[PDB]
Amino acid sequence: SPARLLIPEPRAGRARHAACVLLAVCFVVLFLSLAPITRRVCTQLAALQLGVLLKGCCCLAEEIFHLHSRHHLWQVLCSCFPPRWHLALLLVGGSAYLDRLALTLSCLCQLLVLALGLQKLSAVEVSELTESSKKNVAHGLAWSYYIGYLKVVLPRLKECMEEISRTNPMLRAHRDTWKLHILVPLGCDIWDDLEKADSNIQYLADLPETILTRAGIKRRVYKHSLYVIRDKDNKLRPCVLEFASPLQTLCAMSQDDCAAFSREQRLEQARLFYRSLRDILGSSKECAGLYRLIAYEEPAEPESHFLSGLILWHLQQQQ
Amino acid sequence: SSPARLLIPEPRAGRARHAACVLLAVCFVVLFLSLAPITRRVCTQLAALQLGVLLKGCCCLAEEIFHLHSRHHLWQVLCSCFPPRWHLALLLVGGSAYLDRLALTLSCLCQLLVLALGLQKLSAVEVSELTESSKKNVAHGLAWSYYIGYLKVVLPRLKECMEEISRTNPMLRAHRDTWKLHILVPLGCDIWDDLEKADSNIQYLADLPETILTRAGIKRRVYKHSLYVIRDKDNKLRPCVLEFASPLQTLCAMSQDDCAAFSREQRLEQARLFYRSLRDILGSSKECAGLYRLIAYEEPAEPESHFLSGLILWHLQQQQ
Amino acid sequence: SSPARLLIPEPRAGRARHAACVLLAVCFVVLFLSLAPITRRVCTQLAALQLGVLLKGCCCLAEEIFHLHSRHHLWQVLCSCFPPRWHLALLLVGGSAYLDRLALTLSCLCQLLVLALGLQKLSAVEVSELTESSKKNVAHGLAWSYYIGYLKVVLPRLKECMEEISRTNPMLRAHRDTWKLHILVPLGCDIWDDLEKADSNIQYLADLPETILTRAGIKRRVYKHSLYVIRDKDNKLRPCVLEFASPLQTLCAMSQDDCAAFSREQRLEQARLFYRSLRDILGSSKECAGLYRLIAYEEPAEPESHFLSGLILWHLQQQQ
Amino acid sequence: SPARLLIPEPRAGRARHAACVLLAVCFVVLFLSLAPITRRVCTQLAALQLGVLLKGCCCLAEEIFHLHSRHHLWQVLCSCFPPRWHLALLLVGGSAYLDRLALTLSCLCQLLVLALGLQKLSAVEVSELTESSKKNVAHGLAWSYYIGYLKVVLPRLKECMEEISRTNPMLRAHRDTWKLHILVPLGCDIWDDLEKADSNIQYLADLPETILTRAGIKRRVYKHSLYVIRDKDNKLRPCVLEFASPLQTLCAMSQDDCAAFSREQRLEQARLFYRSLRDILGSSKECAGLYRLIAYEEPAEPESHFLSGLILWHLQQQQ
């Protein structure tokens, strides 16, 4: 190869073997040249093993607020501590039974270490955490969707709508709702059309063509569909509706055999994608007021006009 | 109010530190009620707890010796393995040694036994916080989105498109073992719109007009790929089907934005990670078993006017 | 109300654990009413009861040494033979040994005596719960449904259909000893809709068009089978009848289904179990005595373009 | 063979011979180098034979609620305990006759083990139990029926019925009952046609062909029969009726000599098939409301209009 590529390889995780061999060297050194000594060693091991309890208590105190939003109660208790938590309890109980200045001194120094935060993570640990997680797709989908589509199609919407508003008085009447409505259900189902998703949604027509030139032979053509949705017996409301492609990407990736993408983590990925897309769209100056994305979950009771009511509420919010 | 109901998990308020501080104040208040030499024991225990990260850093550098040349190229390896907050650990160890080695032996034994056994792991809270706090990890998402959107829909329908192409001109019918789409992924982010201008030996052979249509966000399938001709030495000419990586253009555009605050070294790292992720995703696929060949190159320091053409010709030669 | 009267057996609420807990609380309360050395006796009895699972695991590994190469290939055998929650049994055994070996000998003798006589067997409730709890055991059901629906109605009427086929073209009268349908069952789940694109040596010879009609769920019989020709070496050609397995398509669709939550390891296990069940069902039949041949293959790691046709050619050579 | 296959073989069950040789080894070891010792061994053996009694008692306590549904009373007592339960009673009686703290300690230990449930099953036992059951075809039949037939014929029903409806006012009037009515009798008898099964069911016509193209020469064409049922002296009701093929499969394999498929457990298999089909149909988003499976048991008195009244009730339920 003319270009000698230099690509990193995944770490083999051989630090365990080095730790084991140095531990064996430590044994062979200590044995050459004693039950109370072993008891003291066990007590010392139990001495620094109680900091996990303090860290878990602090995390629980900090996370009791988000308990309702994330875990709605045993999940909160089991999440704030590692699954191997009773071992520390057994060790501290054994140390107490065998024997309190040392205990309170150890608690004080451990809590001081926790407060000062001098036990941080080096570069290798954070690098391994970034490399290992192969399912953090939400940020990628958010940035890709933004840059690829919204940064290039959103600004040329008011000018594309004003020409129709010149001849159609209905569009001129509803001037405050000329934005693009993004449908992002927290699940992953995508309806083929919005006419059969809800009987209260009526298709009207497609917006005029959007022409982009690329080298003069390649043309990027964008189509938007304008819908009319019927409220109660007051009037008819027009709007432009479409779903989010990253949701379709997640849905198609879940069905893949080599992806190993389950359903419990797909919901988390969709939620993270929605949050990231909102956070990156809210700080954009190009599409400052050219968008409104609506998020929902399908109700347990199959109401036939739930989505339509949500869109009507959202449309009435602008006025 | 709202027909639906959403519970958006806003990020942590970071009040765990406040709880630790108030507990520490309570501990001082308790110690005030109801001494001096105990400070020596406290310092020795602090040194014993601090030497654990030193042992972990030593093990990490021992494991990273092999990756030294690939990533860091000697001081960089030890700087990365050891957390910068380690001078105070050395000071504490020196003070403990001067103050006094059975205690040190048992302390280090316990520390490295805990480290080797691996019974101290991360609970859900901290791993979730790390997952949701690192805002820039677009490599895996971009790789998956690119694969699903493009590489899983046009690669299977590559034999027939080039079959009609060869029907138009039988010149490429002679070459049958190089009937796969070539992908160029520069480890930087430069993308040439006119690939004929990148190198003087790459010339078009067939590019029929085609319009890319998206109806309400649904992109229409692509039925044509641009056929090229890379001029070899004065012996023959060879055709190819060439493409660039759109996610690299996404990285470039993200780096251009001021609100993104996306730098150059991070861009290089994300590009390399995207390359690795895409290679691993395509390696374990079934529909795209052998209908692709992705070429990764890093632009050379010395100015060469015919670097890319030679590289693709070499890739074609190994393809044969 | 309702004209019918159905008492469906809804699944159990799992309230036996609550009964165990309340009886444990009652026993604790009773022990509180009306001492320390009794804890040692309790621990010894617990260790004596716990060593039974260790003995069972030893017997299981002794039995599975033979099947190690067939299923697990050595740590996998040890992991399967023993329950994961086995460390505490060893801890109890070590504690009992440290506290004290006639008692250990008699306790282990009693435990292995119980294991040998097999007087500890599951009741009706436990086996019923185990049968009704496994929601993914479709191998036997799919095998039986395939056999009854398709394999029992078309195979007996196979000589005569190929008799009219030979009447149309008599080239196949020479191969009189291969008048049996070939079933292709890959242990994976990939299915080729068009058998031409699977291999270059498989060519069609005769497809008389036929419409498969089902009236109100009742499927009509099949009066035509698709005849193929397999290209051997440069000596002659060989005709064949090929067909895949629909239950493999069912497994593939179950895996692709979102609400099924059906993984890949389970898919391979179910495919192997389905193949074994189908082979055992067909081998003990009377109508299908010698009018079938099922070919099971695993896709090779190395890519080969003429493997499947070669395997069919080997089966035809051995069929002579 | 080009691909040497590695297929598992049934386990020979030779762990029992290992247990027997261990019996012999332990006996010859203990004999080398004692009536009270034998009595103590018998007492220890009786000590751990008492846990099955507590297991049966807890099972009876948890199953007294399901007794009416599953066993309708001696069967409840016999099912919750192993048949070889009198042996434990004999051993405990002998231990009591030979001889109180030890019994209470053993009972407490057994209760603690049962409550914690640390005596679970390893991988080999569950694999053997999943391989041994060659008759559990309920789940397989349900999944096969679903994927093969319902996921392909159910979606193309409303559109197939609209064309007939637009010319027949009878179909337009009854629009809420355009589902597919699956008949799943808990028995196994399948009528050749519903005309002679009940005198109140009248055949009307066949639905137009559902044409599916495959490779251009293979055509999967479908027929569905549309019936009309005579209610009381009010009106007539049209519906699409059919039986469930897996019941026919069970009936066919019941008659097979090599199957050894009896009749007592055929009812249980059909019932489990019904429950599994209901569970896997109620959670599907494709056939949300395009079906209604009806289950019944043949009454003792051979009424001539039992099934018709049931379909009339199930049809009035939508209205």
> H/E/C letters for each residue in B147-162?
HHHHHCCCCHHHHHHH
Nearest CB to A59 within list B6, B7, B16: B16
Number of neighbouring beta carbons within 10 Å of residue C82: 20
Residue C11 in tokens: 């699944």
- Residue C76 corresponds to which amino acid? Q
Q: Considering only CA atoms, which of B296, A6, A119, C8 is closest in space to residue D275?
A: C8
Please, is B297 exposed, middle or buried when counting C-beta atoms within 10 Å of its C-beta (0-12, 13-18, 19+)? Answer: buried
Compute the nearest-CA separation of C257 from chain A (Å).
Answer: 7
For residue A302, give the chain D residue with the closest CA. Answer: D288
Read off the DSSP letter of residue B70.
Answer: I
Asked if D229 and D202 touch (Cβ cutoff 8 Å), the reply is yes
Structural biology method used: cryo-EM
CA C170 to chain centre: 42
Radius of gyration for the alpha carbons in chain A, expressed in angstroms and rounded: 30
Using a CB-CB cut-off of 8 Å, the residues of chain D touching A189 are 285
SS3 state of residue A229:
strand
Radius of gyration for the alpha carbons in chain D, expressed in angstroms and rounded: 30
Q: After which residues is chain A broken (C to N over 2.5 A)?
A: 33, 72, 99
- Give chain C's length: 320
What is the C-alpha end-to-end distance of chain A, expressed in Å? Answer: 63
SS3 state of residue B60:
helix
Read off the DSSP letter of residue B216.
Answer: T
C-alpha–C-alpha distance, residues C154 and D294, integer Å: 32
Pairing, β B181-186 against β B202-206:
unpaired
C-alpha–C-alpha distance, residues A157 and A159, integer Å: 5
CB contact set of D69 (below 8 Å; sequence gap of 6+): C7, C8, C9, C10
Q: Is A146 part of any known ligand binding site?
A: yes
Asked if C189 and C251 touch (Cβ cutoff 8 Å), the reply is yes
Residue A44 in tokens: 């010392």
Asked if C136 and C270 touch (Cβ cutoff 8 Å), the reply is yes
Number of neighbouring beta carbons within 10 Å of residue C61: 20
What is the C-alpha end-to-end distance of chain C, expressed in Å? Answer: 67
CA B153 to chain centre: 25
Please, is A102 exposed, middle or buried when counting C-beta atoms within 10 Å of its C-beta (0-12, 13-18, 19+)? Answer: middle
Residue B199 φ then ψ, to 5°: -135, 150
C-alpha–C-alpha distance, residues C107 and C113, integer Å: 10
Number of neighbouring beta carbons within 10 Å of residue D172: 12
Q: Is B98 part of any known ligand binding site?
A: no
Compute the nearest-CA separation of B148 from chain C (Å).
Answer: 16
B31:A108 CB<8 A? yes
Asked if D305 and D229 touch (Cβ cutoff 8 Å), the reply is no
SS3 state of residue C207:
coil
Nearest CB to C63 within list D11, D101, D296: D11
Task: Output the CA–CA distances (angstroms, integers) from residue B252 to A277, B147, C197, C208, in the order listed.
Answer: 19, 19, 41, 59
Asked if D285 and A189 touch (Cβ cutoff 8 Å), the reply is yes
C-alpha–C-alpha distance, residues D255 and D261, integer Å: 7
At residue D61's C-alpha, the angle toward residues D58 and D64, to 5°, is: 140
Q: After which residues is chain D broken (C to N over 2.5 A)?
A: 33, 72, 99
Residue B228 in tokens: 């090229």
Please, is C221 exposed, middle or buried when counting C-beta atoms within 10 Å of its C-beta (0-12, 13-18, 19+)? Answer: exposed
Asked if B63 and A11 touch (Cβ cutoff 8 Å), the reply is yes
Q: In the Cβ-directed half-sphere of D102, how many Cα atoms lie within 13 Å?
A: 12
Asked if A235 and A223 touch (Cβ cutoff 8 Å), the reply is no
- Residue C180 corresponds to which amino acid? K
At residue D213's C-alpha, the angle toward residues D208 and D217, to 5°, is: 115
Number of neighbouring beta carbons within 10 Å of residue D220: 15
Asked if B185 and B245 touch (Cβ cutoff 8 Å), the reply is yes
SS3 state of residue C61:
helix
Helices (H), chain A: 15-31, 35-47, 51-63, 67-70, 74-79, 86-98, 101-116, 123-132, 138-145, 151-153, 158-167, 169-173, 194-197, 245-254, 264-282, 306-318
Give B272-316 as a DSSP string.
HHHHHHHHHHHHT-STTSSSEEEEEE---SS--TTHHHHHHHHHH
A254:C258 CB<8 A? yes
Please, is D158 exposed, middle or buried when counting C-beta atoms within 10 Å of its C-beta (0-12, 13-18, 19+)? Answer: middle
H or E element, residue C29:
helix C16-32
Asked if A302 and D288 touch (Cβ cutoff 8 Å), the reply is yes
Nearest CB to C258 within list A255, A257, A260: A255
Interface of C with B (CB under 8 A): 190, 303
Tokens 């053996």 identify what position?
A: D45
Q: Considering only CA atoms, which of A283, B315, D274 is closest in space to residue C8?
A: D274
> Using H for helix, E for strand and C for coil, what is the string for chain D?
CCCCCCCCCCCCCCHHHHHHHHHHHHHHHHHCCCHHHHHHHHHHHHHCCCHHHHHHHHHHHHHCCCHHHHHCCHHHHHHCCCCCCHHHHHHHHHHHHHCCHHHHHHHHHHHHHHHHCCCCCCHHHHHHHHHHCCCCCHHHHHHHHHHHHHHHHCCCCHHHHHHHHCCCHHHHHCCCCCCEEEECCCCCCCCCCHHHHCCCEEEEEECCCEEEEECCCEEEEEECEEEEEECCCCCEEEEEEEECHHHHHHHHHHCCCCCCCCCHHHHHHHHHHHHHHHHHHHCCCCCCCCEEEECCCCCCCCCCCHHHHHHHHHHHHHC
Task: Output the CA–CA distances (angstroms, integers) from residue A316 to A172, A304, C111, C260, in the order listed.
Answer: 16, 20, 75, 40
D112:C24 CB<8 A? yes
Read off the DSSP letter of residue C234.
Answer: B
C-alpha–C-alpha distance, residues C139 and C122, integer Å: 24
C-alpha–C-alpha distance, residues C127 and C132, integer Å: 9
SS3 state of residue A120:
coil
Q: Considering only CA atoms, which of A101, A117, A122, A115 is closest in space to residue A47?
A: A101
Q: Which residues pair with D242 in a beta bridge?
A: D182
C-alpha–C-alpha distance, residues D246 and D253, integer Å: 10
For residue B286, give the chain C residue with the closest CA. Answer: C190
Give B149-214 as a DSSP string.
IIITTSSGGGHHHHHHHHHH-GGGGS--TT-SEEEEEESS----SSHHHH-TTEEEEE---EEEEE
Q: Considering only CA atoms, which of C184, C193, C190 is closest in space to residue C275?
A: C184
Number of neighbouring beta carbons within 10 Å of residue C185: 19
Neighbours of chain A (3+ CB pairs under 8 A): B, C, D
Neighbours of chain B (3+ CB pairs under 8 A): A, C
Read off the DSSP letter of residue B72.
Answer: I
Q: Considering only CA atoms, which of C233, C128, C135, C227 is closest in space to residue C182?
A: C227
Asked if A148 and A140 touch (Cβ cutoff 8 Å), the reply is no
C-alpha–C-alpha distance, residues B164 and B172, integer Å: 11
C-alpha–C-alpha distance, residues A199 and D66, integer Å: 44
Pairing, β C181-186 against β A236-243:
unpaired
Number of neighbouring beta carbons within 10 Å of residue B284: 9
Q: Considering only CA atoms, which of C98, C111, C126, C135 is closest in space to residue C51?
A: C111
Read off the DSSP letter of residue C171.
Answer: G
Q: Do chains A and B touch (3 or more CB pairs under 8 A)?
A: yes
What is the C-alpha end-to-end distance of chain B, expressed in Å? Answer: 67
CB contact set of D66 (below 8 Å; sequence gap of 6+): C9, C12
CA A248 to chain centre: 16
Residue C176 φ then ψ, to 5°: -85, -15
D157: left (phi over 0), alpha (psi -120 to 50) or beta: alpha
H or E element, residue C227:
strand C227-231
Using a CB-CB cut-off of 8 Å, the residues of chain B touching C190 are 286
Using a CB-CB cut-off of 8 Å, the residues of chain A touching B111 are 48
